[PDB]
Amino acid sequence: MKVAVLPGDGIGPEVTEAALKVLRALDEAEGLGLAYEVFPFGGAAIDAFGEPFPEPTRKGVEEAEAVLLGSVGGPKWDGLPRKIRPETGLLSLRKSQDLFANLRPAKVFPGLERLSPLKEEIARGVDVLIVRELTGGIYFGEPRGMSEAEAWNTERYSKPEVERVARVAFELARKRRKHVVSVDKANVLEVGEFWRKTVEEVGRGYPDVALEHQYVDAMAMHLVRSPARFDVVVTGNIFGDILSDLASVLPGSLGLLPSASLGRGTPVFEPVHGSAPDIAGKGIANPTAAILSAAMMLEHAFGLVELARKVEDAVAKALLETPPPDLGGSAGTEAFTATVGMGI
Amino acid sequence: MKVAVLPGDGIGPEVTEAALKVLRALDEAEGLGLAYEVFPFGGAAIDAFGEPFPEPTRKGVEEAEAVLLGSVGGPKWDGLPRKIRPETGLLSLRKSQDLFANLRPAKVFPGLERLSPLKEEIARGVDVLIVRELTGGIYFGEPRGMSEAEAWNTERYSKPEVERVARVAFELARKRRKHVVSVDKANVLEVGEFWRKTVEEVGRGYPDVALEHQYVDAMAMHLVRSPARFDVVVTGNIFGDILSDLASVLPGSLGLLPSASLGRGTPVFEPVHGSAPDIAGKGIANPTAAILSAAMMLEHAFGLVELARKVEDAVAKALLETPPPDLGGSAGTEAFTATVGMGI
């Protein structure tokens, strides 16, 4: 279980250490063979290598079987050239590993329904996995320009593109509740009809998985009126972006969501939250995201689905007994990691 | 107050008649000089003129001071050539009058907070107006094709396009709570940057209006976690679609929301809902959308803001006292219109 840790900056190291604490325990008491070393990354790496994604980190991720990344960003670099802003290192990291699927989970933990903006009855049972296309769509396509009179961007998709992400969606379903929802806008866009066609063609290989299609705007509605009826949601770039951000508000608060970036290289698991450099080092940051990101890696990078389900539960338990400040409590980082530890 | 009524098909005529019943009463009791004639439109017009938007209808809307349209669509024509499908008639109608702004309101009426999927506290006070670009964006741009290996669509916007919709947005704000939120995806797309630029440029003229910008996905979040802090929301085509459908579920169900199409021609007011051919004629359809549509026309096409606010209230009233089947009740179309009438 070799893992490359890229703590980053802000509460990055903070939340990453906690996940490591939980990980070392889980490993020690289970014999996992977890082996790891911390690598400079983002603004941190910048302060010692000039670049946010240095050469030894690139090698560190390569030779690693998974990546447990924290957070990057900060004012100390918000005024540096793009090519080397910490943000860009995330893109270089992604690209170096060919990460084409960004798994964005959104689950309301039992007992935490009142933390959500949805009535306790709708928030109850919510456990969706939004798989979004990472390297295609209107985000990168050409042409694309601006002028005094007009601007333009291009949403293009290729059969190999859509096939491998949909492929990732069906495999993940097989391990969840076996149901996927390909989202698109096929009723008014060629790409949508093209996205549908391909996914349907790829679903045939996964008969044990139920494929249901839906329009992007219609799906926005059912994500707020019936989130629980959804398991795995596969979709394109810009829409993945919108649907992922939408699902992210369903479970109480954003500092509770993990993240993963699957592709052809070393997977990368990380908290969706920012670096919050202001609260950095004040021990007040909630390590739930980082810890749950650690779960994600166990299940998705090593298949330890049970162990991951364990950690998840422990967190859910801790969020209840010793809730963090953001959850209307007072359990600082250190404290909260202890309680999580318990359920381990 | 000359009005052109295009009942259309499905529950089109059903829900339209109701609004007209409310209308005739409001007029009779207050002397409004409401004058109107119904015109063949959509699938209906197709079975008498071969085309969805016949010549006398075109003339009917032209000479008309406002259009109160119902619904269009049905199986009877789902298989006819595009240039003649009922759906296209809407596009011809919209173009014929240079309508480029779809006003999609979403307000949770006081006392109806429990009808929303959002906690009573967040659904309280919600009254947003989502202004969406109707004739541009990725919806129409070229190129746009399909092939075995790939598909493509083009999102392009022109200074003149973004200026007039944003114009509409600011004038509408002046009459509401004086706040606008231009939505886009400037942080990753040329068009977004372009959209922002222009709207900023147009806002200068409306200093008394507060202009706040937001990204599409981020906005998706605040529309579920903080709807109340929003008044007027202006945005592009596809995004207007997504954000308008989203805000449509905040107040309860979709058959409750009206619609408007502002531009340089005869404005058209219509219920967002579909034609529901199946339930057509079985007096089970909820005329709330159609009647609300009729209120929108009163304020937005005649300025009778008080009268419009009156109808609105009566509908809120009747949706409580004599709720429709969709609202967990059993007050058929004819029944419901009577109660609405009362509050008039």
UniProtKB/Swiss-Prot annotation, chains A, B:
GO molecular function annotation: 3-isopropylmalate dehydrogenase activity; identical protein binding; magnesium ion binding; NAD binding
Matching Gene3D superfamilies: Isopropylmalate Dehydrogenase
Co-factor note (free text): Binds 1 Mg(2+) or Mn(2+) ion per subunit.
Domain of life of the source: Bacteria
Biological-process GO terms, alphabetical: L-leucine biosynthetic process
UniProt key word Oxidoreductase: yes
Assigned GO CC terms: cytosol
Residues reported to bind substrate: R94, R104, R132, D217
Catalytic activity: (2R,3S)-3-isopropylmalate + NAD(+) = 4-methyl-2-oxopentanoate + CO2 + NADH
Annotated site location: Important for catalysis: Y139, K185
Effect of Y139F: Large decrease in activity and a small decrease in substrate affinity
Binding site for Mg(2+): D217, D241, D245
Cofactor (UniProt): Mg(2+); Mn(2+)
Classification via InterPro entries: IsoCit/isopropylmalate_DH_CS, IsoPropMal-DH-like_dom, Isopropylmalate_DH
Enzyme Commission numbers on file: 1.1.1.85
Keywords for the protein's UniProt record, in alphabetical order: Amino-acid biosynthesis, Branched-chain amino acid biosynthesis, Cytoplasm, Leucine biosynthesis, Magnesium, Manganese, Metal-binding, NAD, Oxidoreductase
Any Pfam family: Iso_dh
Annotated binding of NAD(+), by residue: 74-87, 274-286
Subunit structure: Homodimer.
Similarity annotation: Belongs to the isocitrate and isopropylmalate dehydrogenases family. LeuB type 1 subfamily.
Physiological role: Catalyzes the oxidation of 3-carboxy-2-hydroxy-4-methylpentanoate (3-isopropylmalate) to 3-carboxy-4-methyl-2-oxopentanoate. The product decarboxylates to 4-methyl-2 oxopentanoate.
Record's protein name: 3-isopropylmalate dehydrogenase
